[PDB]
Nucleic acid binder design. Structure first.
Lengths: 324, 234
RNA sequence: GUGAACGGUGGAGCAACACCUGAAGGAAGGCUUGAUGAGCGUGUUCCCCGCAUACGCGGGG
C-alpha cells in the first residue's frame, strides 16, 4: 500500500543537519580559517544522483526533511490526537515502558535477545499502532515505511519517475537566516527599568563588569551571533508512506493522523515557527483523496480505524513493551 | 597593530577633558598606579610622558570613551575598565536614585597603503598653535601652510612609530582649509588659551584605515577621528 | 678405482554446495545584528622633557 502526501510549506523548513559548519558575512559556507567564521547549522541535506547535463548523472545536493524525523512525527500526531484520546475515553493506563515504547519503539536501550512468539507477532502486527511502528524489547517489524521529504526539484527528477513532472524548481532552495543574541542588561538603559531587579542598579552594573572582564579575556556569557541555513518556504514537497500488507485499520490510522497533519511542524526550530505546511494532495495507491476538509475518500479505512479505536486497550501496549 | 575603544555611558554627556579630570579625582585616594597607567604619568613623578600617549580619552554622545593604542595600551584599558566602571557606579549611586552605566568595546586594526590619487580627510577640534613662533607662522598663509603640512605628516609618522608599524615615507599631504578658528583652555578659568582649527580638511594620497590622531594635546581628546568611518562616506 | 659405478617417486584428482546485518530510532530546544564610535563649550604666554649646549629647535597636559 503506497501513499504520496504532496505538501506546500508555509513557513521555512529547518531540520538541522549535524556538523559544525561555518559561514562568513556573505556566503562562503565553511571558509578557510582566519576570515572570522560564524557557527552555522545547515538544514538536512540528502545527496542524490541527478541528470545534470545530457548523459551525465552526478551526486548533487538536495535539502530534505528526514524520513526518520517524519516517521516519528506521524507516530507522534497518531498518538497524541487519536491513541491518547482513546486511552483517556476508556480510562486505559499505560506504563512508563508502554508509553516510551509507543512513542520511541523501545522501553530501554537494551533490546531483548529472544524473538517474540508468533501469536504475539500476529496480534501486534494486526494491531494498527504496533503494526505501523514495531520495535520493543523483542524488536518487532513494523508495516510502515516512511520515506524522506523531497521537494519537487530538478535534483529529484530521478526520484519522481511517476507523476510530479511539472511544478519543478530549477534554482537553489535554501536561504541563510541569521539570528543574533542580545544581552538585555546591556540594552536596558534606565534605572526605572532596574527598579524591578532586586539589588538595584549596582547588581546589573556588576554583571556588566563580569561581561567586560570576559570581553578583555571559558564560561560563555551572552550576545552570540549565529546563522542557520533554511529551506525556503512555499515550495512543494512529496512524502512517501509505504505499507507492508496492511490491515485496513492501520491505513485508517495513517489517514486519521494525516488529516490533522497541518497542526504540526515538519521541522526543527520550534520557536521560529519553522515547519508550518499545508497538504496539497494525498493519493492512496495513486488515487487522489485530499480536500480542504481533510481526506475525502477511503471510507473503509476510516470505518476500520473506527472499529479498531473501540476495544483498543492498554494491554497491547503493555505486553509488547514488557521485556522477557 | 590594533587600537581598542571602550565606551562609557553615564546617562548624560560629559566632555573628554572634564572626564579626564573626573577620572583623576575619583581614584586619586586609592589605586594611584592604575591612574599613572591611564594618564601616561612618569613611573616616579606626577608629570606626564613626553612621548606619544598610548591611552587617550575621547568624546562619547552619552559620556566618555577611552582609546588604547598598541598591545600595551589595550592591556591598560583591559586592566583599567572594571575598577573605573565601579567608581562611576558608586559615584552615581551615591546621589539621586542612581543610574546604570553601559559600555561597549571594539578592537579596530590600523592600516595604510599608498595610492596614486589624493583623498579627502577632515578633522574637527585639532589644536595647532603652542608657541609664539607658531603664532608667527599662522599670520601668513604661505608659511602657515607648510607648517600644517609638516605637523600633519609628523603626527602620522609619530603615531606609526608608536604603534609599531611601518609607514611609507613617500606620502604627500595637502591642506585645503578650515571652517572655524577657536581657542582651547587647558584648565577652566585660566587666562592662557591655545589656538585651534575647526573642521580642517587635509588631502593625502595614501589611505588610512584605523584611528589616526593628529596634532597636539591628543590625550585631552583633540584631533582624532576614525578614518574608517569617513572612508567612502559623505 | 670413495663396500664403488646405474637408476625420475611418478602418474590421476574442483573445497564444494546451501545462507538477506537487519530489524527499532525526531537534530533538537532556546535565542531583537543595530546598535555603534560621527554633526554641538573654551579668545593668549603659564608649567615639565629631550637635542643641544643656549643662537634655538623639537612636545607634554
Amino acid at each position: 500500500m503506497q501513499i504520496e502526501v504532496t505538501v506546500r510549506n508555509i513557513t521555512p523548513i529547518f531540520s538541522a543537519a549535524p556538523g559544525s559548519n561555518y559561514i562568513t558575512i556573505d556566503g562562503t559556507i565553511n571558509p578557510p580559517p582566519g576570515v572570522s567564521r560564524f557557527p552555522l547549522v545547515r538544514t538536512r541535506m540528502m545527496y542524490v544522483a541527478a541528470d545534470v547535463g545530457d548523459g551525465v548523472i552526478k551526486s548533487v545536493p538536495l535539502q530534505i526533511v528526514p524520513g526518520n524525523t517524519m516517521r516519528s512525527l506521524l507516530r507522534r500526531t497518531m498518538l497524541k490526537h487519536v491513541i491518547e484520546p482513546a486511552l483517556v475515553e476508556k480510562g486505559n493506563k499505560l506504563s512508563i515502558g508502554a508509553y516510551a515504547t509507543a512513542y520511541s519503539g523501545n522501553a530501554t536501550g537494551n533490546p531483548d535477545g529472544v524473538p517474540s512468539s508468533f501469536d504475539e507477532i500476529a496480534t501486534m502486527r494486526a494491531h494498527p499502532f504496533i503494526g505501523l511502528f514495531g520495535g520493543g524489547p523483542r524488536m518487532l517489524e513494523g508495516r510502515l515505511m516512511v520515506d524522506s521529504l523531497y521537494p519537487i526539484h530538478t535534483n529529484a527528477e530521478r526520484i519522481l519517475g511517476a507523476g510530479y513532472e511539472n511544478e519543478m524548481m530549477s534554482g537553489p532552495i535554501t536561504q541563510v537566516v541569521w539570528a543574533r543574541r542580545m544581552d538585555p542588561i546591556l540594552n536596558l538603559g534606565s534605572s526605572e527599568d532596574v527598579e524591578v531587579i532586586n539589588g538595584g542598579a549596582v547588581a546589573a552594573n556588576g554583571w556588566i563588569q563580569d561581561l567586560l572582564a570576559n570581553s578583555k579575556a571559558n564560561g560563555r556569557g551572552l550576545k552570540a551571533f549565529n546563522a542557520h541555513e533554511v529551506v525556503i518556504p512555499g515550495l512543494k514537497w512529496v512524502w512517501r508512506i509505504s505499507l507492508d500488507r496492511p490491515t485496513d485499520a492501520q491505513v485508517g490510522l495513517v489517514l486519521l493522523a494525516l488529516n490533522k497533519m497541518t497542526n504540526e511542524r515538519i521541522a526543527g526550530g520550534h520557536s521560529k515557527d519553522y515547519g508550518r505546511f499545508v497538504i496539497d494532495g494525498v493519493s492512496l495507491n495513486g488515487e487522489q483523496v485530499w480536500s480542504q476538509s481533510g481526506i475525502t475518500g477511503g471510507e473503509q479505512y476510516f470505518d476500520a480505524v473506527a472499529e479498531a479505536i473501540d476495544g483498543l486497550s492498554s494491554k497491547e501496549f503493555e505486553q509488547f513493551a514488557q521485556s522477557a | 597593530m590594533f587600537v581598542k575603544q571602550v565606551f562609557f555611558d553615564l546617562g548624560a554627556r560629559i566632555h573628554a577633558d572634564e572626564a579626564r579630570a573626573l577620572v583623576a579625582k575619583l581614584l586619586d585616594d586609592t589605586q594611584p598606579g592604575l591612574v599613572s597607567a591611564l594618564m601616561n604619568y612618569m613611573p616616579a613623578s606626577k608629570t606626564s610622558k613626553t612621548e606619544f600617549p598610548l591611552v587617550q580619552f575621547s568624546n562619547f554622545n552619552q559620556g566618555f570613551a577611552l582609546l588604547g593604542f598598541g598591545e600595551v595600551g589595550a592591556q591598560i584599558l583591559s586592566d583599567a575598565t572594571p575598577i573605573i566602571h565601579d567608581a562611576m557606579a558608586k559615584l552615581f549611586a551615591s546621589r539621586g536614585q542612581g543610574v546604570v552605566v553601559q559600555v561597549s568595546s571594539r578592537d579596530v586594526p590600523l592600516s595604510c597603503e599608498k595610492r596614486p590619487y589624493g583623498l579627502q580627510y577632515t578633522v574637527a577640534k585639532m589644536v595647532v598653535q603652542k608657541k609664539h613662533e607658531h603664532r608667527e607662522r599662522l599670520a601668513n598663509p604661505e608659511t602657515g601652510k607648510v607648517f600644517l603640512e609638516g605637523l600633519f605628516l609628523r603626527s602620522l609618522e609619530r603615531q606609526a612609530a608608536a604603534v609599531g608599524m611601518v609607514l611609507p615615507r613617500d606620502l604627500v599631504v595637502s591642506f585645503k582649509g578650515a571652517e572655524r578658528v577657536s581657542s582651547v583652555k587647558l584648565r577652566p578659568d585660566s587666562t592662557l588659551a591655545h589656538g585651534s582649527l575647526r573642521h580642517a580638511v587635509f588631502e593625502v594620497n595614501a589611505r588610512l584605515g584605523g584611528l589616526w590622531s593628529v596634532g597636539f594635546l591628543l590625550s585631552k581628546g583633540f584631533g582624532h577621528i576614525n578614518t574608517d568611518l569617513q572612508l567612502g562616506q559623505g
